[PDB]
Symmetry: D2
Subunit: 440 residues, 4 copies
Amino acid sequence: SEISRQEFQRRRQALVEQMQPGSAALIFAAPEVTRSADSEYPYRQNSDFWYFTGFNEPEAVLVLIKSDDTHNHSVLFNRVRDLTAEIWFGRRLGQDAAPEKLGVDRALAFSEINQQLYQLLNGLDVVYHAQGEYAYADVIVNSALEKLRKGSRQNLTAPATMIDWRPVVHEMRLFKSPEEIAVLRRAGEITAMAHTRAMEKCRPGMFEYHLEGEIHHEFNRHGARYPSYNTIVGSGENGCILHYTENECEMRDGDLVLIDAGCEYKGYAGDITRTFPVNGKFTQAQREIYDIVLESLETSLRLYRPGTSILEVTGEVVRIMVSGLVKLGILKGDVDELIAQNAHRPFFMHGLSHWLGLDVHDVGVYGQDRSRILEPGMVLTVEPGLYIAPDAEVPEQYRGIGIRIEDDIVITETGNENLTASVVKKPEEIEALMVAARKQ
Amino acid sequence: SEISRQEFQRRRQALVEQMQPGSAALIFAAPEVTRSADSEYPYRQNSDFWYFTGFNEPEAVLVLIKSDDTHNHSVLFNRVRDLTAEIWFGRRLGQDAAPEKLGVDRALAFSEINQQLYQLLNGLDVVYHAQGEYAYADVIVNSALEKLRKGSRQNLTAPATMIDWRPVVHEMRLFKSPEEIAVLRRAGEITAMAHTRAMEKCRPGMFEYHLEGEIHHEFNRHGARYPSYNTIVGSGENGCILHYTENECEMRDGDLVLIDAGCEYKGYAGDITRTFPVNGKFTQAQREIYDIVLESLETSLRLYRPGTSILEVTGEVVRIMVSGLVKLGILKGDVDELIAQNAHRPFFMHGLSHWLGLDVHDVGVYGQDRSRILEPGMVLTVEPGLYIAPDAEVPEQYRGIGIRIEDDIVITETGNENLTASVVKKPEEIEALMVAARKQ
Amino acid sequence: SEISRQEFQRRRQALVEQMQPGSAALIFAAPEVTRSADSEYPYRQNSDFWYFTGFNEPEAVLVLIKSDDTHNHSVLFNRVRDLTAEIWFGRRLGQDAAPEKLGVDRALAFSEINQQLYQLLNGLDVVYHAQGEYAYADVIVNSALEKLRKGSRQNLTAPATMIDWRPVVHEMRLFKSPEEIAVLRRAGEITAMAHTRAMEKCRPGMFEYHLEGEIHHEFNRHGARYPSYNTIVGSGENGCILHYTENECEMRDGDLVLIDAGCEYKGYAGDITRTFPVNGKFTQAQREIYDIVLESLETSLRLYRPGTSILEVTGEVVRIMVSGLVKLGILKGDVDELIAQNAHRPFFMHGLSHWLGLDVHDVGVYGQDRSRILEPGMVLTVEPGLYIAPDAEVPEQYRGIGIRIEDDIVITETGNENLTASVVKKPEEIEALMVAARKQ
Amino acid sequence: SEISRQEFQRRRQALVEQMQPGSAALIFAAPEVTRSADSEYPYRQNSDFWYFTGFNEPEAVLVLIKSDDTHNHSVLFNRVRDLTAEIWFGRRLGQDAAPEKLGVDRALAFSEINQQLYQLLNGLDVVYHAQGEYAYADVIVNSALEKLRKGSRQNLTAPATMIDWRPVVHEMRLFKSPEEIAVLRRAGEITAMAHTRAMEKCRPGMFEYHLEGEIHHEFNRHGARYPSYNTIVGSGENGCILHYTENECEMRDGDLVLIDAGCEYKGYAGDITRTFPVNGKFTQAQREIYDIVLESLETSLRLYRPGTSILEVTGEVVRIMVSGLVKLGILKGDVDELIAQNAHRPFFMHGLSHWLGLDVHDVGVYGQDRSRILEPGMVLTVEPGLYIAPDAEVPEQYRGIGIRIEDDIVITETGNENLTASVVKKPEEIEALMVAARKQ
Ligand SMILES: [Mg+2]
Ligand SMILES: [Mg+2]
Ligand SMILES: [Mg+2]
Ligand SMILES: [Mg+2]
Ligand SMILES: [Mg+2]
Ligand SMILES: [Mg+2]
Ligand SMILES: [Mg+2]
Ligand SMILES: [Mg+2]
Ligand SMILES: [Mg+2]
Ligand SMILES: [Mg+2]
Ligand SMILES: [Mg+2]
Ligand SMILES: [Mg+2]
């Protein structure tokens, strides 16, 4: 699956729709980023610039100009073609091919931006600009606005009003289109295939990083070159660290391993967590914690639908957790009191769900305590977990256990669609999968 | 192989040896680096800070203070321990364990650096600081020096002399120790195993990125999690782009594929290029260009030794190239004239060799036109190539061919040691390897 | 005359009137300014901050908050009282006395501004801020807006809309109130008395700076301590330099001297230019140029009224100038052609009039080529001049003559009021004045 | 008196003498400084740049290059000549006339500095630069050093060593030459004449600012256009504020008035304080405090000579003060105990002496607690004072009295020369002077 030329067009028009007449929106590309000395990390475009262009170069600026309610046009600034730079660092779109390729009306050299941008903003009332996003962008925009302010004698005037387009653009990104859902559907399949493979390959004596290698190879083979975030492979006590990425330890028979990993496919993030026994067999103590987390997930998957909220479902998960923990003697006392005292917090200290999209922790307003009413098109994670510290004052068998199980869902008209259910999570199915792999 | 506590100690003492009495050297850690929104790229420590510490955290500063010719001490600034931050983002060394772990005399909280650094520089004559390396570092150092300048009434004085330690430190890094050579020896084996695997897996119909996936999996399985630079898989005309990293095309029967890839093992870079037929069989036209590049490499490997230079060997390679190209009718005229006119430059437009170490394009002074006399302990690449543009005015059969063959070497007492010869480069051996893999 | 507490109040309310509901306006004080090392120039408050407060301290910020159409309040940030700092550098208002003294609702320590400002902007829709005016202000405002943007989990939100208040505030300053006109009326008297005195004291052999001294002493004695701009005393050829401030030459019998000087009285600028003979007697050649400039001024003073413009009156002055210059043989040809060719420009190369107020070159929109229709309450200069270069190709007797005559006026219902006519400008009256003084 | 071409030359050569071979010193001009909107304060050159050039323009940089022990040359960067800018803002030296006028070897356009400076520093070992002095300078220098660092392939190299020239240059400025002493001698006469005049003009009912006006007029008439610092006229309780500059109160019969004022003559500061009765007659209570301050000054003037220090003389002044104050019942107890308890500090809370020169608070190292041994050529103030707060718990008659008496001296071979003794300070001589003036 992919995002069409026409979809990028629709998104631009939808932003322009909400802009005031006599205004310009300015969307800047991500800078290149040093890894060490003269080497650079693989380039990752700014999500918002990507959202409106599908253009994967730095030193580019999309300018959307609205003259009035029926008249608007687009100008791209981008790198000029250069035989020497391209022989070295790779091909460039340039100005000639850009109008057709990206569906913009006009394209100019990024090197001319300081000589051209102020002319585009001259006489407008409003400029939409994400102030503070990138320092190089602020310099360019402030420089342009100063020329206009001080150019009274050359009959120049600056827009007096500057508006942050991020609330508007992020509200758009919060609701996925059918094309976006298809792309995320495939991201979820790819990511699920990766997690299935990690389960199948896992043996005692392998290092945590080895499963990272298997996962990244599986991402890559389906055309998802990069992860959406740094892969987490926390075996044993490392599972109690939420974003453990060292992945440096030998995996030991008897421990669990928690894998949080997600591919990036056409810009969109998968995000799956699966926890399982390194030796393919859950112990009683591991099952007892796992079952609480799994019931939390399974109940949440039944509940999530239009009209409820992350806050409301989180409440049901807390009840399930506190009850499970009391029955095991990890918590003591009255359930309803313990809930009122948030007694679960030492063991479940993060949110149940975050938005998912072009960013793994996606943009969009949550409301107070994530109380926003869910509607169809929202995409989010469901990721309950229990993390019992090595030194927690609880029965010994539970100490040093970290379990999280995470699925990705899209809210539909009547409920939700699970994008990541193709990788197993019921303990018996995990055990069958690993047994089958060990024969073969 | 690894770098010992004692080696890090020796390096610090060797820097201190060259510092003036009454001075302090300040070495700063790399900042964390955003990939998109709140996600960050895998952390890569500054090479120079790593060189003196083997410490892989940000927000850290090594301060080496020389009182006189026999008295010196070290102070580390580093992140404080924090239960909440560690439950989330992973374990931290802290101040207590740092003296023993990293062999420094004292360790303070990075959060106290503005209250403590000026006290450490007070009354010194000289401060060694890499001005411009990182903006956050300059702010901290300038802030400290200003307090001292303006603190006359509190009996404070600033060092009047600031010296860049990069020439000195980079001159040290240019000469590898036995431990460093062992680590690079292993980086070369790992990288070679990766390139061998890519050759064995390559089939027509696979995409360039698939070989990237095989290479990264092989790096990872030997404990080299990250590449030293963004992997290059240029098939067909993409081979004529020196740093082609899109790796997005279907590999076609009949084309060559050029792979430039290198692992990062304990901080040190491997860097290998191998070019080969996608279908396992070189054509006449491909052999004719390949043989010129291979003779260039093989001759360079015979020549490199103490007493010569990159410039001098490059001269021999130019002769070999210009002659080969004349015999094929790609160049016309007298060899010696064509050499004097640098007629090879449209086809070989980069240097033969760069320094290799903690950075793939390593630090250290080359001399004018890379004329520096080679000595034992220097580590460098040997990477001749020929790149015939798709539109070059040459016989049709050579158009769109890009071939590079790259090995990594260390200069020894009597010649050089090739760290990357475990992956084949003679065409007959490449063909046998791919045939053998295809049976299976 | 002075500006009342109630007037400052009215101005704030008039700004608040035009602000959107759910917004805050932020007006910052001028920074202190180094003259050399640890000495500072006499403090000059930002005109706009002064306009709304009459408060003469740095490190102060006026915040006007509009909740809705009938509810608003004001918060001042200002320096805290400090016995040590006040024993040294002078008294401070502080927080306790500020509400009553400056008519604001609340006053907080400037040192707490970063901990308090974001709380004041939290939940608002719009912030009015003069972006780029002062770097220290931008840092404070951007810092506040970032806290809000990133404080989603602490239920903070930033205003998405930022509006420059300078167009609005400067449009207010363009129309003077009765109190402002009374203050400028007195500034004009004081400035006129200064120019009269300079004429009376001038003798051949005195230096240009001596008349500067007489002028500044006269400003000071009526309570106008500082000039509104650096005084210009250009004798001889120095009169051809528009903003000659070196004032370093001996004044010579036979030359003219051009004095452009203006006091600053309660913040408001006077701005007068008078040119006269150093020896008290105009020559024929000097009269011939002077009379053209004087007719230009006198005609402009008759013409200026509501309904015309600076552009339109400037047209009449050009006609007068071009005709005068043709009759003297300084220009040759047809008057109407020479006008169409702007042939006057080598001799009159500046505008006839600028706005006058809290700044000598006052704020307010001029329109294209200063075409804005004049209305009652606008205050402006009338300053025609002719400057014949020492090397101009014109009859010798005119070379090196610089003459300007400048009055300050306020547009009234039926015409204008001249605030500076108490110093003479008709040549016979100048000569009588200087003769009378010489007896003284 | 003035500073000769040859003296400026000598100073440059004396700096060059102390510079390392293979180095360049960079000395930058002061920026222009806004007073309000588009008006600027009178330009004041950076003292150190002035010290080596006598050049009074901004956008200028002196570069002194030392190749070796007998070879050096100078390059000036300065504003280019421009007919339009000069017709407006005044004459400019330009490049052609600068070598001869300022005795430099070469002169280039300031607008070309970024294209030329790095070429001047290329291949040098050391650059002397006052880091942090001006941001515009740091940008220019860092920009130049970065080009060199990164220009290895263009055979460029940066000096690795940067040295602050301010300690060296300020140590030079601490010792005045005969020409400098002559100029300061005249600054002291001019300043003294001003203070004499203020005493003669003072009447009850005049405002503090009126005496400021008389003082500035007297500075101006002897060719000292600007004060060296903001004039202080503190009558009554305002005399207890050390740097009272509001000068806004009516002077009242019965009060004292403290005047601290100093001219700037050819760059050099006078600095005199005289305190006297507004009505020309000291009261008993005023005499009792005045006599202690005067004995302090007179004793200090006898003591100051080579071999002593500011610290040592300050000790004698403390004894005199503490004794005087005990005899009046302002302090109670044993003198030697009260000295040991620094009991004088509530009444004398500043230093006795500061260096004087191109800055009123001149550059140069004081030593701990101003213990530096005095030598001939040092120029300094002697300014004891007693300031009894309005609310001090002391006999009523002393409350609200502020008295300071300040003279300027140069240390000679055998003692000191008083540059400011031409204005009276013995109370009987003050009273005679004011009586004589009143007849006016
Ligand atoms: Mg996750
Ligand atoms: Mg997640
Ligand atoms: Mg256990
Ligand atoms: Mg390579
Ligand atoms: Mg290489
Ligand atoms: Mg071909
Ligand atoms: Mg004027
Ligand atoms: Mg004017
Ligand atoms: Mg003449
Ligand atoms: Mg003084
Ligand atoms: Mg003083
Ligand atoms: Mg009294």
